[PDB]
Swiss-Prot record, chains A, B:
InterPro entries: AimR-like. Keywords: Activator, Latency-replication decision, Transcription, Transcription regulation. It comes from the Viruses. The keyword Transcription regulation applies. One of its GO terms (biological process) is latency-replication decision. Homodimer. Interacts with the viral arbitrium peptide, this interaction changes the oligomeric state of AimR from an active dimer to an inactive monomer leading to lysogeny. NCBIfam families: lysogeny_AimR. This is AimR transcriptional regulator.
Amino acid sequence: MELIRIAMKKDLENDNSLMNKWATVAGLKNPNPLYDFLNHDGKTFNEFSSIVNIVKSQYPDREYELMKDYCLNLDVKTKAARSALEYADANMFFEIEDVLIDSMISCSNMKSKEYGKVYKIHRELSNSVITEFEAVKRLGKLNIKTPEMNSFSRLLLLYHYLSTGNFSPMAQLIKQIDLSEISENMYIRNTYQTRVHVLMSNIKLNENSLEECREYSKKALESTNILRFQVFSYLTIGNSLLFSNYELAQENFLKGLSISVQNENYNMIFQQALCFLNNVWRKENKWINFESDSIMDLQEQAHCFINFNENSKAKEVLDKLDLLVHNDNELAMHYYLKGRLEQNKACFYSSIEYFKKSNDKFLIRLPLLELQKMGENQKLLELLLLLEHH
Amino acid sequence: MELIRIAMKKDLENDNSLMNKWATVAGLKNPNPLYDFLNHDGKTFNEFSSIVNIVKSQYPDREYELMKDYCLNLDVKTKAARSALEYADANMFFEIEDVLIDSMISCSNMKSKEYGKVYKIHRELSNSVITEFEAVKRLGKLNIKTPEMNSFSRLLLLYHYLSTGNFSPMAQLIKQIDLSEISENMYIRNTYQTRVHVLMSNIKLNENSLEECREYSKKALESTNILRFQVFSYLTIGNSLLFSNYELAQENFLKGLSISVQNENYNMIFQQALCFLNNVWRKENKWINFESDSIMDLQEQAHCFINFNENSKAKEVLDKLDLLVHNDNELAMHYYLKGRLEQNKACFYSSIEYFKKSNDKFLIRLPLLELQKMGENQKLLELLLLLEHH
């Protein structure tokens, strides 16, 4: 048996009311599939949310342990296995996910093989094994048939656009996704819906449409019980308040921290959001990572040094940054930091240029402010706001 | 007998070598179609340019008179009649065109009927009898069959975009014209190629792609004997040199003037282009119309006064302009004039705003130059150069 089933039987001996509890949690509408699940090997529910909700309601502290065991004992040709692939990916359980992909690609079920091949494209692109052009080419050559994978083929590009600061294509591409065409696997329809909520929220953020940003993140939170999606929802809500409400921004970062501090990756992501928050507000900053050579962390070192008039220490950090490769959104911030250090309007104009190229209407408020303080003409600033890059 | 045949026979006695002279002017190998043309009623040359060329060679002072008599006597089911329709429309011989249109729409030849109907839409659209939307809708319901009218359906729309200064959709639209599909009527193939050359030239002008602009206009000039297209080729060539070559720009405007001596509207056009030329180069301007309340004429008054430090007269003229309603491009020039009169950078940014609104990448060089002269940052200027309105 599976660890989850061993543990479900043991606690069934000591408590029988669990059967009605487990059946209502899994939405079964009568407990026959449960009994079916436990008594015979290989029996799967028809919707994956039946185990996940049960593993959440009753063994929440060992979700990973139990699902890593169950998922990797699942026949990779089944619908539950195809579901476990999305479960693993959405939770960023790459140990579960990368094993399923290998088994599904070499397997004899074509639907599983399609899921596997496109999730593999997502994994290689998000680890910079292939370029965006190669990912697109490979997806075309796949001749994708399921509505699930036609949806995810667009999700993986949207995640790549986000991470590479290339925001202009995202809105048109996200609008091509039609989740209603997914009708056989509700778990995948339901998690993909949460994905689209988080992504729309981020698209709104970068459009400087902050109220609508917060609505989509609120919809995302209400629509999910997956920790990864709660994390990025509180992060995006917090970030929408960066320039307006310091304490409410901090409160969302600390709320996201309260459910995720144990995880090293999530711990770092809220540390960085808090670090940028305190730099924008020019406060003392206990969140800087002085032991890092990532662009984000070095930029925050320089931003803080600049806020406190430590110009040579700032220049020293920016000398390091000059020798690192930047994407367009990172380079925009780089020139903004330079413009503040040198009090040089041309560097602020180069920052705007790259914020326009990345199509970031949110962070561009930083160089615009500095040009305002230096007495820039108001019609000129209005002009720069209404012109785009294309 | 039509007048042209009467006159041709009459002159054939005096100079019997005219038969051979006309044979080569009409592009015939042997003179039997010419012999056919004079002696037998109702028969046509295979290509309409044969008789157009003869009329221009030997009776150029009577072109309208002779061609109106000849065209309005054609059987409208014939290729000569469909050719005559385009000949009338290209020359703006509206009295011939309108009669051809009505007779064609009612005849039993579905090809002539289709020609009549889409030229009809072109005339109604170009006189604002109908909106663009109604014109697209009407062309849609025609389900256009011939390659000629598929081409012309696009040309009439480009003329509308041109008439309204809406340059943005023009490059996309003109790229869809494929004149190589026009194989049966070479007269229409050739005149449409002139139409496309001239439209391409004006397109390139507005893009500030000036060497290509002049190439397409020289291609237009070499391809045609139609006054309208010669006039606008010389105008566009001269305009393309406004910022580079005073003497060659003047030479092209004066050549245009020479061929439109007895066309009041064309004459005024070259007068206005020379007036603008002399204000761009800040020379004495003997082309100014001081008895005019059109925007363009008044702008040139103010431009000349500003050039010659006559700022009170200049303010008087701009006072007059303030009480007149300006469109987008006109407003761009207005702010340029105000910015130079008041020496104020802000009115130059408004000038740029409206040049960007009209997708005029040529005339925008005027405020950009003044901004540079007032010490505007070089990276700002590039930014204003690169960014687009949408």
